[PDB]
Design a protein around this motif. Structure first.
Motif, PDB file in Angstrom:
ATOM      1  N   UNK A   1      22.854 -48.991  40.284  1.00  0.00           N
ATOM      2  CA  UNK A   1      24.196 -48.919  40.847  1.00  0.00           C
ATOM      3  C   UNK A   1      24.192 -48.770  42.362  1.00  0.00           C
ATOM      4  N   UNK A   2      23.468 -47.796  42.898  1.00  0.00           N
ATOM      5  CA  UNK A   2      23.293 -47.692  44.332  1.00  0.00           C
ATOM      6  C   UNK A   2      21.829 -47.553  44.686  1.00  0.00           C
ATOM      7  N   UNK A   3      21.029 -47.208  43.682  1.00  0.00           N
ATOM      8  CA  UNK A   3      19.594 -47.027  43.869  1.00  0.00           C
ATOM      9  C   UNK A   3      18.880 -48.355  44.099  1.00  0.00           C
TER      10      UNK A   3
ATOM     11  N   UNK B   1      16.328 -49.432  45.797  1.00  0.00           N
ATOM     12  CA  UNK B   1      16.098 -49.833  47.181  1.00  0.00           C
ATOM     13  C   UNK B   1      14.982 -49.013  47.823  1.00  0.00           C
TER      14      UNK B   1
ATOM     15  N   UNK C   1      14.101 -51.261  50.392  1.00  0.00           N
ATOM     16  CA  UNK C   1      15.272 -51.467  51.234  1.00  0.00           C
ATOM     17  C   UNK C   1      15.373 -50.342  52.255  1.00  0.00           C
TER      18      UNK C   1
ATOM     19  N   UNK D   1      13.046 -50.851  55.330  1.00  0.00           N
ATOM     20  CA  UNK D   1      13.653 -51.686  56.363  1.00  0.00           C
ATOM     21  C   UNK D   1      14.537 -50.975  57.395  1.00  0.00           C
TER      22      UNK D   1
ATOM     23  N   UNK E   1       2.879 -65.635  57.954  1.00  0.00           N
ATOM     24  CA  UNK E   1       2.512 -67.042  57.855  1.00  0.00           C
ATOM     25  C   UNK E   1       1.186 -67.182  57.115  1.00  0.00           C
TER      26      UNK E   1
END
Ligand SMILES: Nc1ncnc2c1ncn2[C@@H]1O[C@H](COP(=O)(O)OP(=O)(O)OP(O)(O)=S)[C@@H](O)[C@H]1O
Ligand SMILES: Nc1ncnc2c1ncn2[C@@H]1O[C@H](COP(=O)(O)OP(=O)(O)O)[C@@H](O)[C@H]1O
Ligand SMILES: Nc1ncnc2c1ncn2[C@@H]1O[C@H](COP(=O)(O)OP(=O)(O)O)[C@@H](O)[C@H]1O
Ligand SMILES: Nc1ncnc2c1ncn2[C@@H]1O[C@H](COP(=O)(O)OP(=O)(O)O)[C@@H](O)[C@H]1O
Lengths: 581, 571, 97, 96
Positions: free
Chosen positions: C1-3, C5, C8, C11, C45
């Protein structure tokens, strides 16, 4: 509901919709279906780029402007997208809560909302994973009860194998067939739509560039449909000119048919662009430009250049090819060479000559190689040798080489290409020969063509060879030929003029290597003893460079005195020729 | 005031620009596509280089300098914001309120400024931006590959009303040349870095000769920056340095996964004395009949002189089959490609069906099986490297004879569906199995210049004069004697030596002991095919009989004896 | 639901700029688990690096044998080192060298 | 791989990779090594050619006679990758 369905009715109040011109029999039939009691669901069946999405944008503009009946007055046209309903539907019934969220918002609208499901075939089998379909099986009750007013807009073959396979969903829609407009019916489409493009491009578009945006689209672009390419062309031309005013009366902004045919030549490759080229130099010298590379054969070019002038003047039959020729006569005279010239004139590329050798079609089983195999047989989905090649190049000179060596039952395949310019593939698709030139070389009267050419001046080889031995007994094929062309054999007058363009096209590159040669006049008859043939023709002249001129260089390497950089000669002696440095 | 504001006045203040050089007729195309209103979304498709950097830097150059007045300039557009979309947002649906807030509140000035969006393939490619693209909001510049375009963006139907395939064609060697022309603004004024002319081209020539599975400019900008990183870190590894920049900086970077040095990577004008004596003449001292194709017929091919539409490098080479053809077509590929990939053999010997129409140069319609078809139908679509053979074409009934005339001339280039076939870098070895089958017996007084003119003069033009009227250079392969195969029977035994020293047996063999094999060895019909089974039946199947029996213990070398009527090597 | 991450959150060190990465992991697990995160593989790359050779892993085995000679109290002999690298390369196919 | 000549000729291209390299690609793209298997293909292509072998064919020319009938059925790249083509004789009265 407001998360998925684009509202076309409030997109019409802002003036964001294209002005819809015409379509008033397909909009009225749509409202006739949209006012039905049960199953009030029109499906605007057409073809890609006919205007079935701009019928509901001429229905949603109509509801706002009020030319609808009372009953459709004040409705909303919501454009449901079945790509935004299967967008993030990962889990079980995330798709079904999107429809039953949309379908329950449409029931709160109490019938004041028309639902435009563009591309209904994307609804057949949407969130279908478990088993039974989930999009045209959830709409299926509210489509039959006359409850959600679903304007579909699919194409006819996408209706045929998606919606027609679900026979219980096929009946909940009424086919409002959107036929594509004709070439004159899409000018009025584009005369009123031109100002919506003038205000975006800041580019003036003349109606000369609109009367020719549709006659050149319909004639030359055959895969697309008409109000999609005619408006593609003006949008491409207005973006081509929008470069010429930005970066680098004579710096113009006006689109004319010069710019429209230039974009279309950049699309397809047909250079009919403007007559301010050397085309005025070319249209009456159409018979002598062939004479640049067809030496002699005045009866040959006056049959092919007069038939391809007959259609550029718009005077030829549009249910028949441009030319249907029977090139019976001797071998190596200008038969195969004129069709390269005729392709290098009309479509200005001698690679656009579809040569087909009819000795490969000797027996009757090998006729479905030209026309295609039937459904269920080997080589069905491949196609035919002639039909698929004409679908590659519809603008080509078809050479049918030595048709007297074909089976008699391949002239039967070649009765419809000559008479109507059509040939149906094995997959039931018809290819269109109306832009091709069907030239058929033969050797059926060549024994009597060669002996009488310096006896019967220019017309009696046509008469009286037909009936004793030649083709009249099978009479349905002769009269479908446009001009039966007989070929006079080449004397010494022509092969001296024919043996001059052997390296003329390679001549324009290879000077600085150490080669530039002018005409030598003593070895003229060394090639005119094997090449100038009364019997076999002038085709052993092409071996008379591979056997006569090119030999003592590429194998005489190792001896150690002849090295390249010196131009060879040939003289009339018993020499076993020398080369001095 | 952080996310949705990018100011393009800064790009000359900081020097944040990597200039595009080379692409102008493929970027003004993406300004033709973009300037429309039907289908005004260029998606850039292919190998790299553009990627929304060519239309944005090639936009301020024509306004601020001032050749055109101000009554025409004003096409001031902006670029991508993509960074802070997914990061910093926590909940479900409160991530979505940031994406709906980035598109709707750019409409505060009634379209005074317009905006592009870049790199739209992921899905943000038609799940949350699809009403934002269908409502006619603003127009974006996509960037996909070709195969990831037909994964997402073309088997849709509502998206190609706005997008269209913009393909860019494969770029030059001058892509990274001008990357290091401008960038000395950052290199020499503060660090004094020079990179010379043979050092930019060195990391960029790796495509048409070295490796052709990968794109050029991704392999060009990375293999310069690693070679330019030499000075400041090799001085911190606890006459001093070549300041003259040579091929050495890239070779430390490039050859750290191959093992081959500089010495044959820049084959040049004077290097053709060095490329005579590397790998062809150490496996075998010999095979010098085919060295002529790289000596006298190579001057007009590799100096920008290869004209494909007439044979110049096509040196004709004859012989028998199974006798040395397939090794040299691999050993010349081993001399070029540093490995073994050339697997080509064509013979017209023992098949009578109607499938000989597709083995010519492709199938016209009315057949079965286009995916394989003939061998040469597939040998250009696999990879463009193959060495074409032609064997045993002389046997079938004469309706099939004259179809060998059509490809060797300048009439039509003869491809199959619209992409090219190989006309420049192929040596054709063919096989003559006419009356050179009785001549294989003796090696005494064999002809080199008496063979092809007086033997062939009276036997050719009775049945068919259209075969040797073109083809004339005839020189034979090796006659199958004794000692020339005693080298070849040592090559197949030395791969039996390495097969045997893994278990601790080093076997010797005499000059007398391996010509014991020569009575049961070669065949004039098959070539050197029955050599290998003669190793199995004479020594190798009796050898495994003795390794398993334990009477040949590892460590002791054994010798042979001449013995009773079956010849095995026992004690 | 909001977790969901864990990566995330990292970042927000790339918003700092402080986030740095040297991706050495399973290749196809780098494809489908870094699927939607283009802000984790921005311009990372393709530069080559993978399994070694048979004589490269003999040097691996010759320096690691002292950890296996003392865990087992055996004497791993240098024929057994070469035969463990040659035979496993030849015979075992699903595993890496 | 018994009754191998009854297989469709697109199975011999799959079987060829086994005799070429020892490898064979799974339909999920896995490489399977066959270098330690014995691959036997039972066929009877030259069936009515070995029934006349009792006169003047002691397995040297008979091997090349059936490899004429087999070469009409298998590709020449397939037969050379077979290690040993074996011709079975018909069973005599003393074998039964
Ligand atoms: N009668 C018309 N009047 C005005 N504009 C029209 C008319 N018919 C078509 N157009 C325009 O021409 C184009 C035709 O595209 P569509 O209307 O989407 O047709 P289409 O059948 O939906 O094509 P597809 O393949 O299904 S998207 C659009 O730009 C329309 O605005
Ligand atoms: N009337 C003609 N005009 C120009 N060239 C000709 C003419 N007749 C013959 N030729 C030359 O003779 C050659 C004939 O070659 P070929 O195509 O093999 O013969 P055919 O056309 O009978 O198949 C052509 O290359 C062409 O240059
Ligand atoms: N013609 C060119 N002009 C300038 N730079 C180029 C050119 N071709 C390639 N490059 C460089 O190559 C790199 C390609 O990287 P990128 O654009 O991220 O790849 P992609 O386009 O696949 O996303 C860029 O950094 C660019 O600087
Ligand atoms: N330089 C050479 N001299 C003689 N024979 C060779 C040479 N190189 C390879 N061979 C033989 O060629 C054989 C393979 O030939 P064959 O199977 O008849 O033709 P292909 O490999 O083209 O099918 C190998 O067994 C090998 O012994």
């Amino acid at each position: 509901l407001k998360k998925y369905t684009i509202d076309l009715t409030e997109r019409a109040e802002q003036g964001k919709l294209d002005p819809v011109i015409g379509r008033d029999e397909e909009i009225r039939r749509t409202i006739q279906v949209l006012q039905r009691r049960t199953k009030n669901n029109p499906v605007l069946i057409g073809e890609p780029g006919v205007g079935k999405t701009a019928i509901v944008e001429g229905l949603a503009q109509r509801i706002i402007n009020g030319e609808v009946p009372e009953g459709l007055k004040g409705r909303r046209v919501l454009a449901l997208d079945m790509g935004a309903l299967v967008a993030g539907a990962k889990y079980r019934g995330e798709f079904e809560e999107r429809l039953k969220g949309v379908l329950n918002d449409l029931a709160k609208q109490e019938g004041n909302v028309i639902l435009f499901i563009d591309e209904l075939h994307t609804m057949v089998g949407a969130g279908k994973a478990d088993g039974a379909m989930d999009a045209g099986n959830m709409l299926k009750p509210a489509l039959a009860r006359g409850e959600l007013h679903c304007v579909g807009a699919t194409t006819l073959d996408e209706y045929r194998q998606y919606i027609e396979k679900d026979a219980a969903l096929e009946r909940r829609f009424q086919k409002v067939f959107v036929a594509e407009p004709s070439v004159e019916d899409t000018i009025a489409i584009l005369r009123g739509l031109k100002e919506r493009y003038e205000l975006h491009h800041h580019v003036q578009i003349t109606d000369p560039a609109i009367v020719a945006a549709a006659t050149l689209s319909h004639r030359y672009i055959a895969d697309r449909q008409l109000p999609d390419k005619a408006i593609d062309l003006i949008d491409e031309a207005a973006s081509s000119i929008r470069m010429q005013i930005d970066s680098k009366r004579l710096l113009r902004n006006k689109v004319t048919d010069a710019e429209i045919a230039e974009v279309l030549a950049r699309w397809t490759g047909i250079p009919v662009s403007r007559m301010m080229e050397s085309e005025r130099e070319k249209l009456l010298r159409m018979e002598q430009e062939l004479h640049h590379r067809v030496i002699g054969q005045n009866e040959a070019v006056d049959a092919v250049s007069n038939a391809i002038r007959r259609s550029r003047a718009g005077l030829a039959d549009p249910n028949r090819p441009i030319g249907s020729f029977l090139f019976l006569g001797p071998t190596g005279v200008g038969k195969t060479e004129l069709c390269k010239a005729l392709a290098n004139f009309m479509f200005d590329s001698d690679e656009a000559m579809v040569r087909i050798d009819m000795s490969e079609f000797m027996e009757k089983h090998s006729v479905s190689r030209l026309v295609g195999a039937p459904p269920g047989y080997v080589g069905y989905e491949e196609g035919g040798y002639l039909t698929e090649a004409v679908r590659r190049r519809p603008y080509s000179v078809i050479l049918l080489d030595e048709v007297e060596k074909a089976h008699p039952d391949v002239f039967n395949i070649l009765l419809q290409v000559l008479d109507d310019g059509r040939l149906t593939d094995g997959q039931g698709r018809t290819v269109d020969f109306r832009n091709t030139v069907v030239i058929m070389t033969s050797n059926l009267g060549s024994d009597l063509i060669q002996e009488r050419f310096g006896e019967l001046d220019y017309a009696h080889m046509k008469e009286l060879v037909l009936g004793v031995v030649s083709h009249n007994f099978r009479p349905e094929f002769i009269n479908r030929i446009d001009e039966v062309v007989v070929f006079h054999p080449l004397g010494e007058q022509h092969i001296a003029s024919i043996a001059q363009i052997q390296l003329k096209r390679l001549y324009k590159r290879l000077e600085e290597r150490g080669y530039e040669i002018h005409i030598s006049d003593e070895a003229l008859k060394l090639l005119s003893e094997n090449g100038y043939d009364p019997v076999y023709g002038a085709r052993p002249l092409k071996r008379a460079i591979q056997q006569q001129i090119e030999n003592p260089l590429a194998q005489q390497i190792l001896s150690g005195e002849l090295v390249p950089g010196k131009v060879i000669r040939l003289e009339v002696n018993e020499d076993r020729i020398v080369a001095v440095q």
